[PDB]
C-alpha cells in the first residue's frame, strides 16, 4: 500500500504503486513530509501499470521523485458530527481555526457520496420559510432547492446569510453550513468569522450554529474543487438525522473554475472555452446532493459570480441549470437605507406559481412587481414632466410603489445589536396578507417612513395608532 512518486508537474503528481495494490480513482495519497505533517493528494486517473495521476491539494514545492506515498484506501475522509459545529475546516477536514484538532472518536465520512435516489425525492415542491418578507414573497425558496444571490459588497449579503442562519436555527433546528469556495481570504475570513461571532441570537452566536469550510483562491485547484463536497458531506450528516440544513456555497462558480484548472493540468482535452469536458457531470455530482428527501432537506442559497457580465459563459449557464431561485441584491436599494437590498424585480423563483405557493400568494406577488413592472416607469416621465404636475391616477401608483418599496425592508435580529431595533420574523402568510391589504388601499392612510422598518402591516398599524 506504499508507492513511489514518479513525476511532479505543478500540482499534478504521478505515483507508481505495486501491481496488486493500486489505489482507487478517488482515494487519498497522503504524501508524508519531513517536518511531521503530510500532503494529502486525491487520485484522479488510474493508468499504465500501477501508476495513478492525482491532484496535489498542496504546494508541492519540496517533493523529490522518490518520496513514498501511503494510500489511505478510502477517499478524503472528513470529520462529521456535532463536534464539527461552530468550527472552521479546510478541504481535508483539518480544523484551521485556533482551537484544537478534532478528536479521533468523531466519525469520519467519505467526501464522495451518492446523491439520494429518485424514489426519495419529494413529488411536490415545497416553499422554504425564511421569514424575510421580500425573499418569502418575491423569490420564495424551495425545500432542498438552490438560490443564487447576484450582489457585490456593501449590499448586506453577509447580514442576509447571518439572518437566514439565525431564522432557520430558531424556527427549526436549523444547523447551517458555509463553504467559501474560491473566496478572498479577507472577505471570506475575519470578515465572516468576526461578523457571525459578534452576531448573536438567543444568547447564542450565529457562528456557534454554523459549520465553515474554506477553500480560498490561494489553495491549489483541487482544494477549491473538493471544498464543496466537504461541506456537502458535513451537511449531509445532519440531514441524515432529519434536521433541516441551510448551506451557503459562496462562489459556486469558483468551484467550476477550479475543475477547469484541474482538467487543464490533468491533460484532459479542453471543452468549449477552455472548460473541462466533464462540466455537467461535475456540477451534477455537487448540486444533486442538495435536495429535499423524506428525512431532511439541505436547502442551499449559493452565490454566483459571472465573469464580466456574461451569462452565456458555460460556467454561469451550468450553474443556472441547477438553480431554483435568484435574488438580485442592488446598490441603489442598499444605499437608500433599505437594509434588505433584494430587488423586487430581477429576482425570480420557479416556486412562484399558484399551484405551489397558492393562488393568493401568486396573485399578490403579481399585483406587486406590476406597479413596479414599469419600475415606476413614471419616474422617467416625472423627470421631464414633473408628473405633468400630477398624474390622473398614476400619482396613486407612485405612492403605493414607494410605500411597498419601503415596506420590503425588515429589521433583522442579527443586526438588532447594531441598529438597536428588535428583529422581526414574518411568516409567509403574514407577508402575503400584509401586502394584499396594502394593495387594497388600507395602506393609503399612513404616510411613508411608517413602513420603513416594520415586520407586518399590523405592526405598521400599531405604530400609526400610537
Amino acid at each position: 500500500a506504499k508507492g513511489v512518486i514518479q513525476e511532479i508537474i505543478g500540482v499534478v503528481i504521478r505515483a507508481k504503486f505495486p501491481e496488486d495494490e493500486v489505489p482507487e480513482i478517488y482515494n487519498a495519497i497522503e504524501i508524508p513530509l519531513g517536518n511531521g505533517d503530510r500532503l494529502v493528494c486525491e487520485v484522479q486517473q488510474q493508468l499504465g501499470n500501477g501508476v495513478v495521476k492525482a491532484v496535489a491539494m498542496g504546494s508541492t514545492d519540496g517533493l523529490r521523485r522518490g518520496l513514498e506515498v501511503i494510500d489511505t484506501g478510502r477517499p478524503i475522509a472528513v470529520p462529521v458530527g456535532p463536534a464539527t459545529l461552530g468550527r472552521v475546516f479546510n478541504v481535508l477536514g483539518d480544523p484551521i481555526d485556533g482551537m484544537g484538532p478534532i478528536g479521533p472518536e468523531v466519525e469520519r465520512r467519505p467526501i464522495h457520496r451518492d446523491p439520494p435516489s429518485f424514489e426519495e425525492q419529494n413529488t411536490q415542491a415545497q416553499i422554504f420559510e425564511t421569514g424575510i418578507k421580500v425573499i418569502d414573497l418575491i423569490a420564495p425558496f424551495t425545500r432542498g432547492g438552490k438560490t443564487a444571490i447576484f450582489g457585490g459588497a456593501g449590499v448586506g449579503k453577509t447580514v442576509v446569510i447571518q439572518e437566514l442562519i439565525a431564522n432557520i436555527a430558531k424556527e427549526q433546528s436549523g444547523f447551517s453550513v458555509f463553504a467559501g469556495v474560491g473566496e478572498r481570504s479577507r472577505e471570506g475570513n475575519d470578515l465572516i468569522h468576526e461578523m457571525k461571532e459578534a452576531r448573536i441570537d438567543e444568547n447564542t452566536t450565529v457562528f456557534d450554529k454554523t459549520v465553515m469550510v474554506f477553500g480560498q483562491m490561494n489553495e491549489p485547484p483541487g482544494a477549491r474543487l473538493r471544498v464543496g463536497l466537504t461541506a456537502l458531506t458535513m451537511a449531509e450528516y445532519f440531514r441524515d438525522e432529519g434536521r433541516d440544513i441551510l448551506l451557503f456555497i459562496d462562489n459556486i462558480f469558483r468551484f467550476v473554475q477550479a475543475g477547469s484548472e484541474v482538467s487543464s493540468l490533468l491533460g484532459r482535452m479542453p471543452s468549449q472555452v477552455g472548460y473541462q469536458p466533464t462540466l455537467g457531470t461535475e456540477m451534477g455530482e455537487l448540486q444533486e446532493r442538495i435536495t429535499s428527501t423524506k428525512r431532511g432537506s439541505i436547502t442551499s442559497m449559493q452565490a454566483v459570480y459571472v465573469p464580466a457580465d456574461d451569462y452565456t459563459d458555460p460556467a454561469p449557464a451550468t450553474v443556472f441549470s441547477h438553480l431554483d431561485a435568484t435574488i438580485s441584491l442592488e446598490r441603489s436599494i442598499a444605499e437608500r437605507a433599505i437594509f434588505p437590498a433584494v430587488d423586487p424585480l430581477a429576482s425570480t423563483s420557479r416556486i412562484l406559481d399558484p399551484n405551489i405557493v397558492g393562488e393568493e400568494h401568486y396573485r399578490v406577488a403579481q399585483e406587486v412587481k406590476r406597479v413596479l413592472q414599469r419600475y415606476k416607469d413614471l419616474k422617467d416621465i416625472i423627470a421631464i414632466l414633473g408628473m405633468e404636475e400630477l398624474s390622473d391616477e398614476d400619482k396613486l401608483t407612485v405612492q403605493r410603489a414607494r410605500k411597498i418599496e419601503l415596506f420590503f425592508s425588515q429589521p433583522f435580529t442579527v443586526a438588532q445589536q447594531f441598529t438597536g431595533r428588535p428583529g422581526k420574523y414574518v411568516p409567509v402568510k403574514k407577508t402575503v396578507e400584509s401586502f394584499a391589504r396594502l394593495l387594497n388601499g388600507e395602506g393609503d392612510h399612513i404616510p411613508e417612513s411608517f413602513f420603513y422598518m416594520q415586520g407586518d402591516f399590523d405592526d405598521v398599524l400599531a405604530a400609526y395608532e400610537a
Binding site: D20, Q46, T123, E288, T291
Partner: protein
C-alpha cells in the same frame, strides 16, 4: 396440473444445456479515467456492445459499459454506472447484445433508466419483448403525409403552430421560459386522444424529474406516459443513451401498439427534455475518449447524433401499420443564440420550431411563444378543419398587430383603422395567454377563436379578455353542453361553420355576453 411443470422441467434439464467448457475471451481494465476504461485485449466485441465488468471482491453488483471505441489493442468502454469502483486489472466480459430496452404495455406509468431498469421503486418491469436501441429510421417509402393533429391544448401552439402525428416540433427557449411547461401541457392534453406520451428527461435534476412525475400522476396522466430519466448526477453514458431508449420505447408503440383504455393505440409522443444536454453529454463522452473535436468542442458526428434520434419519428402509412411517433425535442439556448451549433443542427433537423422568448415570459405573456419566428412546416395539414378555418384570421390579425407592435403605447394618436388593428391584436395576444396545467380541448379553442375573430370581444376590455375566456368556456361547459359536442362532431367538416353549428355558437356567445358584464 403440477405434472405439466414436472414434464416441462426434467426435460430441458436433461437435454437442454451443452455444459461443454470452452475458452471465452475477456478483457483486463488497464486504465480508468473520468468514466472511461480501456479494457485491453477484448476481441469479438461489437462496436456498441454493453460490456459487463463482472462482480469482484468488494463489489456484489455489476457495472455495465458501452464499448464505444474499438481501437487496436484497446477498447475504450464508456461506463454506464459509477466509475469509482472499476480499477485497473478488473476483468470484463463482452455480452453479445447491443443495448436493448424492454418495451410494450408493461412500461406505462413507470419511471425507468435508459437501460429499462425501474427507478420509481414500484416493482420489476413486466415485459416480454426488448427493442434494440440505435435502429435504422423507418425509411422513405414507409411513411405518409402528416394529417392527424396532435392537440397541444395551448391556443397559441394549437392554432398558429400546428403539431401533427409524425411531425417533429422543436421547443427551443432560453433557460426558465416554459419549455417543460409546454411539454407537460401537451402530455396532459392526451387524456382521451389515444396517444402514449413519453418523457425522456435528459440531464434534468432528480428533483425536477420527480416534480414532473408528480404533476403527471396528480392529473392522472401516468397511465399512458412512459418516463425515462438520465439525471445530471448519472454518468454521461446514461444521458447519452437516454433519448435512444425513449424513442425505442416509442417505436414499439408506433409499430405494435399498446392497449390503452381498451383500444389499440399505435400513436406515441416523445419529449426529449434537453437535447442541449444530450449534446453536452455526448461531447463529454467524445472528449474523454479523445476523439477529435469540432466547433464548440462538439464531435463531428453530433449532427448525426440527433439526426438518428429524430429521424425515427415518423407517420407510418397503412401498409406498415398506420402508427405514429411525434417528437418534441427541447433546447435551452443562451441569450437567444439561435445561431449556436446544436440549436442550428436541431432546427435544421426538425420540421418546426416553437420559439419561447424570455422577454415575453417576463412581460406577462406567460406562454412565451414568438409567433413571428416560430414556424410549423406541416402547417394546416396538422389542424382540424374547424381550427384551420378559424385560425386564419387569428394569424392575419396577429401579424398585422406585430407590424404595428411598436405603436401600442401611441394607440390614441393614430388612425382609426390602425387603432382598431392594435386593439384587436392586444385582445388576441391576451387571449393566447394561458395558465399552467389548464389545456383547452379542441372544441373550446375553436369556440373561443370563433368568438374572437368575429367582432365579439371588441366591447370587452383587454385586461379582462383572459377572464372572459375563463368564463365563456365555463358557460359552454355548464349552460350549453350541446354546442361543444356539436363543434367537436363536425370539426372535420370541410366547411366547418355549417349553418347549424354557426347558429348554435352565435346564440351561445350572445347569451353569454348578454348575462355577463365586463
Amino acid at each position: 396440473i403440477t405434472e405439466e411443470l414436472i414434464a416441462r422441467l426434467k426435460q430441458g434439464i436433461t437435454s437442454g444445456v451443452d455444459l461443454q467448457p470452452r475458452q471465452v475471451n475477456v478483457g483486463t481494465v488497464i486504465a480508468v479515467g473520468d468514466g472511461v476504461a480501456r479494457l485491453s485485449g477484448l476481441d469479438q466485441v461489437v462496436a456498441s456492445e454493453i460490456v459487463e465488468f463482472p462482480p469482484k471482491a468488494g463489489r456484489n453488483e455489476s457495472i455495465y459499459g458501452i464499448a464505444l471505441n474499438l481501437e487496436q489493442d484497446s477498447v475504450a468502454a464508456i461506463i454506464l454506472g459509477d466509475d469509482e469502483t472499476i480499477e485497473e486489472g478488473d476483468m470484463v466480459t463482452s455480452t453479445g447484445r447491443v443495448i436493448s430496452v424492454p418495451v410494450g404495455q408493461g412500461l406505462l406509468g413507470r419511471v425507468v433508466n435508459p437501460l429499462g431498469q425501474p427507478i420509481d421503486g414500484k416493482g420489476p418491469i413486466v415485459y416480454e419483448k426488448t427493442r434494440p436501441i440505435e435502429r435504422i429510421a423507418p425509411g422513405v417509402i414507409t411513411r405518409k403525409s402528416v394529417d392527424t393533429p396532435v392537440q397541444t391544448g395551448i391556443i397559441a401552439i394549437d392554432a398558429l403552430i400546428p403539431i401533427g402525428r409524425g411531425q417533429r416540433e422543436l421547443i427551443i427557449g432560453d433557460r426558465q421560459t416554459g419549455k417543460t411547461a409546454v411539454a407537460i401541457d401537451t402530455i396532459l392534453n392526451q387524456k382521451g386522444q389515444g396517444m402514449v406520451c413519453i418523457y425522456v428527461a435528459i440531464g434534468q435534476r432528480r428533483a425536477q424529474v420527480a416534480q414532473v412525475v408528480g404533476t403527471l400522476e396528480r392529473f392522472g396522466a401516468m397511465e399512458y406516459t412512459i418516463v425515462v430519466s438520465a439525471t445530471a448526477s448519472e454518468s454521461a453514458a446514461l444521458q447519452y443513451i437516454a433519448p435512444y431508449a425513449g424513442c425505442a420505447m416509442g417505436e414499439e408503440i408506433m409499430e405494435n401498439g399498446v392497449m390503452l383504455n381498451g383500444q389499440l393505440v399505435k400513436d406515441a409522443l416523445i419529449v426529449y427534455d434537453d437535447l442541449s444536454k444530450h449534446a453536452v453529454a455526448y461531447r463529454q463522452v467524445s472528449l474523454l475518449l479523445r476523439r477529435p473535436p469540432g466547433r464548440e468542442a462538439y464531435p463531428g458526428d453530433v449532427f448525426y447524433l440527433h439526426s438518428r434520434l429524430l429521424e425515427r419519428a415518423a407517420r407510418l402509412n397503412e401498409e406498415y401499420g398506420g402508427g405514429s411517433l411525434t417528437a418534441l425535442p427541447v433546447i435551452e439556448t443562451q441569450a437567444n443564440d439561435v445561431s449556436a451549433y446544436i440549436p442550428t443542427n436541431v432546427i435544421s433537423i426538425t420540421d418546426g420550431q416553437i420559439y419561447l422568448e424570455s422577454d415575453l415570459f417576463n412581460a406577462g405573456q406567460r406562454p412565451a411563444l414568438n409567433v413571428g419566428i416560430s414556424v410549423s412546416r406541416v402547417g394546416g395539414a396538422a389542424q382540424t378543419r374547424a381550427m384551420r378555418a378559424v385560425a386564419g384570421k387569428l394569424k392575419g390579425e396577429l401579424a398585422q398587430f406585430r407590424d404595428l407592435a411598436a405603436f401600442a403605447q401611441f394607440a390614441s394618436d393614430l388612425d382609426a383603422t390602425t387603432k382598431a388593428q392594435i386593439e384587436r391584436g392586444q385582445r388576441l395576444q391576451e387571449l393566447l395567454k394561458q395558465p399552467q396545467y389548464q389545456p383547452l380541448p379542441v372544441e373550446d379553442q375553436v369556440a373561443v377563436l370563433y368568438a374572437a375573430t368575429n367582432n365579439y370581444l371588441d366591447d370587452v376590455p383587454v385586461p379582462l379578455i383572459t377572464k372572459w375566456r375563463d368564463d365563456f368556456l365555463a358557460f359552454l361547459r355548464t349552460a350549453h353542453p350541446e354546442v361543444r359536442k356539436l363543434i367537436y362532431d363536425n370539426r372535420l367538416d370541410r366547411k366547418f361553420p355549417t349553418p347549424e353549428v354557426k347558429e348554435a355558437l352565435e346564440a351561445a356567445i350572445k347569451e353569454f355576453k348578454a348575462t355577463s358584464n365586463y
